[PDB]
Amino acid sequence: MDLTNKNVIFVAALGGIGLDTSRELVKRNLKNFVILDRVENPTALAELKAINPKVNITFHTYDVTVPVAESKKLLKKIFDQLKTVDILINGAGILDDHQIERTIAINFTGLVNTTTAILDFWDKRKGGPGGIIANICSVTGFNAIHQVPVYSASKAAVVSFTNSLAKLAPITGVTAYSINPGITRTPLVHTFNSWLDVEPRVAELLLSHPTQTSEQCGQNFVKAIEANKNGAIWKLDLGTLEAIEWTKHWDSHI
Amino acid sequence: MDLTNKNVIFVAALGGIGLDTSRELVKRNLKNFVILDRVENPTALAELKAINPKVNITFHTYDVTVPVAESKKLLKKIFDQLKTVDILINGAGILDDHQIERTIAINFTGLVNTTTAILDFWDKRKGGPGGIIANICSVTGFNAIHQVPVYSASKAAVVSFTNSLAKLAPITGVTAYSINPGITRTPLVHTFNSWLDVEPRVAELLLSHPTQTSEQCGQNFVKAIEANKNGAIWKLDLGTLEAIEWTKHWDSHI
Ligand SMILES: CC(=O)Cc1cc[n+]([C@@H]2O[C@H](COP(=O)([O-])OP(=O)(O)OC[C@H]3O[C@@H](n4cnc5c(N)ncnc54)[C@H](O)[C@@H]3O)[C@@H](O)[C@H]2O)cc1C(N)=O
Numbered sequence: 001m002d003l004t005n006k007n008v009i010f011v012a013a014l015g016g017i018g019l020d021t022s023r024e025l026v027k028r029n030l031k032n033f034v035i036l037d038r039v040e041n042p043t044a045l046a047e048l049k050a051i052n053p054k055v056n057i058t059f060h061t062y063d064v065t066v067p068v069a070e071s072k073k074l075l076k077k078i079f080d081q082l083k084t085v086d087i088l089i090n091g092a093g094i095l096d097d098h099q100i101e102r103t104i105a106i107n108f109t110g111l112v113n114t115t116t117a118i119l120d121f122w123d124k125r126k127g128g129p130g131g132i133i134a135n136i137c138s139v140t141g142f143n144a145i146h147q148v149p150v151y152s153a154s155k156a157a158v159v160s161f162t163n164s165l166a167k168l169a170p171i172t173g174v175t176a177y178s179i180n181p182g183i184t185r186t187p188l189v190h191t192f193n194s195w196l197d198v199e200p201r202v203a204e205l206l207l208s209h210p211t212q213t214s215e216q217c218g219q220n221f222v223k224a225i226e227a228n229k230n231g232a233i234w235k236l237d238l239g240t241l242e243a244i245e246w247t248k249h250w251d252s253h254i
Numbered sequence: 255m256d257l258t259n260k261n262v263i264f265v266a267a268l269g270g271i272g273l274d275t276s277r278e279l280v281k282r283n284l285k286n287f288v289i290l291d292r293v294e295n296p297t298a299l300a301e302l303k304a305i306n307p308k309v310n311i312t313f314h315t316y317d318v319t320v321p322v323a324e325s326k327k328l329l330k331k332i333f334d335q336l337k338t339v340d341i342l343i344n345g346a347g348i349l350d351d352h353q354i355e356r357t358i359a360i361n362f363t364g365l366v367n368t369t370t371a372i373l374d375f376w377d378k379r380k381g382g383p384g385g386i387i388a389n390i391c392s393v394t395g396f397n398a399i400h401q402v403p404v405y406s407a408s409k410a411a412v413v414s415f416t417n418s419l420a421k422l423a424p425i426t427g428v429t430a431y432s433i434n435p436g437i438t439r440t441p442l443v444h445t446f447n448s449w450l451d452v453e454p455r456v457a458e459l460l461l462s463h464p465t466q467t468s469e470q471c472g473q474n475f476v477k478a479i480e481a482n483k484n485g486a487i488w489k490l491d492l493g494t495l496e497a498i499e500w501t502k503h504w505d506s507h508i
């Protein structure tokens with residue numbers, strides 16, 4: 001798909017992977033780039049606006065742990081201005097297995113709730129135009145980092161949820177694919193809590209293995225968006241972009 | 255493992271799969287069988303007690319959506335009386351993708367919290383004896399029923415979470431394995447809501463394919479418990495018991 005003149009909403013665009021993805025995205029001559037993020041970052045906004053003055057960049061404070069009704073309210077405001085939105089990127093994520101409930105609320109529930117809210121505007125059953133959802137999941141949704149079992153389980157959830165969304169496309173009009181980075185040097189992984197501190201040095205041990213930069217990650221992210229393959233499960237690991245095949249262990253037949 | 259004179263806690267023992275599993279379990283001459291479930295069923299209780307009068311059967315009202323501190327409170331009493339608990343079975347589950355938050359809270363968060371609570375009594379790092387966790391996940395954790403994407407993603411999370419538990423056993427002393435039933439004729443699947451009603455006939459379509467009874471499921475469940483294989487991923491589908499191999503797509507190296 002061609003990003004020229006598209007309207008994009010990116011939830012959690014100002015994080016480490018987000019920001020480097022965002023720098024590449026706004027190079028593509030979007031019409032509108034809507035950033036939804038919990039925490040203002042004024043420096044990153046100015047930087048992004050610097051790169052490509054043609055793009056209209058707007059920022060709205062958004063916490064993905066709000067109720068679906070609050071998401072719908074905010075999204076109505078955005079559709080009211082923009083009329084159409086082509087792509088939603090769900091990128092919010094924390095890594096701290098001391099915060100069990102909060103990990104699941106942000107990494108899993110909130111992504112489902114934002115998706116659920118936007119379907120109100122996109123669902124072809126309601127007359128909507130359909131749309132495209134890019135979900136930032138994680139290779140730990142494939143195979144856990146088992147010293148952070150909660151984080152990894154929340155990401156296994158959103159890989160599954162994204163697979164299912166992609167299979168609902170003929171009914172809803174909304175296609176979907178997951179973006180699953182391998183270990184990427186950002187503030188997320190520099191220091192973090194393991195579950196019941198089974199491994200207090202998890203961050204040190206993790207970064208003694210090969211990693212990628214957020215710029216490598218960001219570059220491959222935009223390529224996967226431009227590939228626009230419904231149901232792809234993209235692995236972005238050590239600077240490459242690869243589609244994995246999900247194992248069929250069981251089939252519901254429906 | 256030999257179940258004779260074992261002490262078992264079974265969360266959600268009085269449901270469709272639970273009850274048929276429980277009938278087999280109490281045949282094995284447990285010392286103590288502790289049922290935790292959201293509501294008492296004196297019919298089922300009296301039945302179970304009838305089958306094997308040697309087993310001491312106790313019931314406590316438990317909702318898995320309470321905070322960890324409440325779980326610990328309840329567990330502390332149980333450990334104090336029984337002194338040792340050999341096996342915990344987490345089986346609570348709902349199926350209703352109109353209740354997004356509630357699905358996640360019961361199917362995923364609640365299982366994590368019960369597990370987190372009991373580790374206080376079992377963790378070998380704290381002087382505990384270690385222990386055995388059997389988690390009821392679902393084949394939809396392998397491959398979704400995509401008309402109930404939230405239910406299925408919640409079960410993908412607990413499969414992942416169970417795999418990670420099993421890999422933490424050398425540190426915690428607590429082994430674990432998942433029990434993943436295929437479609438099993440119980441009140442769970444007779445009628446249920448799909449997500450945004452993408453498929454209002456999901457139950458009808460599902461039960462037009464081969465199923466298994468809860469008695470078949472129940473028999474194979476006790477065999478898997480007797481197999482006692484840490485890290486097993488057990489599929490209980492169409493009356494068989496099979497261990498699946500999880501695909502290694504990615505490795506954390508730690
Ligand atoms: C460890 C791992 O998962 C491997 C890899 C894959 C996935 N991820 C994921 O990629 C995404 C971005 O992570 P990062 O490395 O950029 O981390 P980061 O902490 O720099 O970025 C976090 C982003 O999520 C947003 N966010 C957090 N809580 C929010 C809330 N309640 N509402 C709205 N936004 C919220 C922040 O405001 C910020 O924009 C996350 O979803 C994360 O889980 C990270 C990596 C990595 N850094 O190596």
Ligand SMILES: CC(=O)Cc1cc[n+]([C@@H]2O[C@H](COP(=O)([O-])OP(=O)(O)OC[C@H]3O[C@@H](n4cnc5c(N)ncnc54)[C@H](O)[C@@H]3O)[C@@H](O)[C@H]2O)cc1C(N)=O
Nearest residue numbers: 266268269270271317318345346347392435437438440442
């Ligand atoms: C549908 C599917 O995923 C295939 C299969 C695999 C796994 N499962 C899982 O098996 C387990 C039992 O399902 P079932 O079919 O016996 O359903 P059921 O409705 O008869 O039983 C639900 C059990 O969970 C308990 N429970 C629910 N909410 C609770 C709460 N808040 N606190 C404490 N306990 C609570 C109930 O009280 C009951 O004991 C669930 O984890 C379920 O998701 C069912 C099937 C099946 N029935 O075909």
